[PDB]
Amino acid sequence: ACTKNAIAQTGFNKDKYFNGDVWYVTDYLDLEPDDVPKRYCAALAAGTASGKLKEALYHYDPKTQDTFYDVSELQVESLGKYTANFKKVDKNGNVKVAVTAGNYYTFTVMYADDSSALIHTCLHKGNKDLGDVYAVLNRNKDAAAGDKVKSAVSAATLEFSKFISTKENNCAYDNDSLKSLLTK
Numbered sequence: 203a204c205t206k207n208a209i210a211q212t213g214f215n216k217d218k219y220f221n222g223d224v225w226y227v228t229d230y231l232d233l234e235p236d237d238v239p240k241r242y243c244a245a246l247a248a249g250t251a252s253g254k255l256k257e258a259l260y261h262y263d264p265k266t267q268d269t270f271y272d273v274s275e276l277q278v279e280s281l282g283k284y285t286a287n288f289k290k291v292d293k294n295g296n297v298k299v300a301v302t303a304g305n306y307y308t309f310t311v312m313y314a315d316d317s318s319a320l321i322h323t324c325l326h327k328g329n330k331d332l333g334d335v336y337a338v339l340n341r342n343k344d345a346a347a348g349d350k351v352k353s354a355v356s357a358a359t360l361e362f363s364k365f366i367s368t369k370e371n372n373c374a375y376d377n378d379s380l381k382s383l384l385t386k
């Protein structure tokens with residue numbers, strides 16, 4: 203179960219974050235760890251598509267090769283905090299698993315600038331019991347976390363030393379599919 207009410211960034215700039223471009227997860231912290239494997243790849247695009255706030259997600263387990271994409275139209279709870287009912291799609295946007303009550307994540311942007319971000323997400327999926335996941339994002343898939351985002355991790359009363367890096371997983375991403383999925 204999730205336990206955190208994450209606080210959104212003061213002065214969060216939604217249009218800059220939701221600009222249609224890709225964010226890569228570089229590091230993550232799962233508060234209920236055996237939620238998820240140690241050795242993971244994830245990325246997202248987020249933007250407005252024909253007036254609708256959207257995210258597209260990609261997950262890849264570099265050991266098992268388990269791969270999935272998702273798309274959601276985000277609903278606003280407050281500036282920088284969203285609820286996202288997702289649908290699993292192939293890379294081209296064809297629906298594999300339709301939107302369904304109880305399949306949603308929340309999404310809080312705790313810090314962002316043009317190149318980096320810190321987010322909190324709480325996943326709900328059927329009768330699974332999942333916990334809080336924090337993620338450090340960068341526009342550059344190879345970037346080491348810099349002082350702005352590491353300071354934001356401390357300001358959330360988290361220790362960056364606990365975050366697990368994605369950098370040694372050979373992650374390769376289809377940026378084109380993430381951008382195009384925003385429309386789907």
Ligand code: HEM
Pocket residue numbers: 227230237238239240241242244245246259261270271272288289290299306307309323325327330335337
């Ligand atoms: C970047 C922010 C993230 C968001 C918004 C997010 C969102 C989601 C969503 C919506 C699903 C369900 C997809 C579906 O069934 O169609 C999912 C599943 C999953 N995510 Fe993430 N995720 C994020 C990052 C991560 C990270 C960093 C990991 C690290 C291992 C991770 C591990 C998983 C796993 C293992 C599942 C499968 C859960 C299951 O069905 O048992 N995710 N995530």
Ligand SMILES: [N]
Pocket residue numbers: 325335
């Ligand atoms: N997740």
